[PDB]
């Protein structure tokens, strides 16, 4: 596991080329995330 940038606690990936895309985030300490909800689902075929 790598380290966070000096003086930071995570990394935010900002979508640039893609307009509709939302952010992605990276942490380097497993303790900075708690799994709250477990979702069971299926992807649905478009009409």
């Amino acid at each position: 596991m790598a380290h966070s940038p000096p003086g930071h606690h995570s990394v935010t990936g900002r979508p640039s080329v893609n307009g509709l895309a939302l952010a992605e985030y990276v942490i380097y300490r497993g303790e900075q995330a708690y799994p709250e909800y477990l979702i069971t689902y299926q992807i649905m075929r478009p009409e």
Binding site: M1, A2, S4, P5, G7, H8, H9, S10, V11, T12, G13, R14, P15, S16, V17, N18, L20, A21, L22, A23, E24, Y25, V26, I27, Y28, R29, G30, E31, Q32, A33, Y34, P35, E36, Y37, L38, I39, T40, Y41, Q42, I43, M44, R45, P46
Partner: protein, 161 residues
């Protein structure tokens, strides 16, 4: 391990706010569906809360450390995480093994605001070989599982793409 899964009824308001965040954050991806499949919406089969005192007190403790290092602001978000190891994550918690060493932003645990993005990793990197039964990365039959996690970001380094 201390983990218990409590089912939520679709009439519960928590269930509905979580399903909404799951559905409203779908988007088309530049691979055309190669990794996560072709779909505009999900069919939610079940939503369960994860309860584990050791893992929660482990999170709230680090959250306090981050908050005190960032003008009492933990910068907490609710983000999606897709992985083949969801079963190990809900029982043992996040750790190095659940990191994407080849990730664009370093060897760490990756989260998304787009549920559809996390869906690309449910079966492994780039969808892997698809579902274990049909080897179909766009399987409309097999059941999938995502995690809607409470994440502490603190001061986050901004990496533009």
């Amino acid at each position: 391990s201390g983990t218990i899964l409590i089912d939520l009824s679709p009439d519960d308001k928590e269930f509905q706010s979580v399903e909404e965040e799951m559905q409203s954050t779908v988007r088309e991806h530049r691979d055309g569906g190669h990794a996560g499949g072709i779909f505009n919406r999900y069919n939610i089969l079940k939503i369960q809360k994860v309860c584990n005192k050791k893992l929660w007190e482990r999170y709230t403790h680090r959250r306090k450390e981050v908050s005190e290092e960032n003008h009492n602001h933990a910068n907490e978000r609710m983000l999606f995480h897709g992985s083949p190891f969801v079963n190990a994550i809900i029982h043992k918690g996040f750790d190095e093994r659940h990191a994407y060493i080849g990730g664009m932003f370093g060897a760490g645990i990756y989260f998304a605001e787009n549920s559809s993005k996390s869906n690309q990793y449910v079966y492994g990197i780039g969808g892997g070989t698809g579902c274990p039964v049909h080897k179909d990365r766009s399987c409309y039959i097999c059941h999938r599982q995502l995690l809607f996690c409470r994440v502490t970001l603190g001061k986050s380094f901004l990496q533009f793409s």
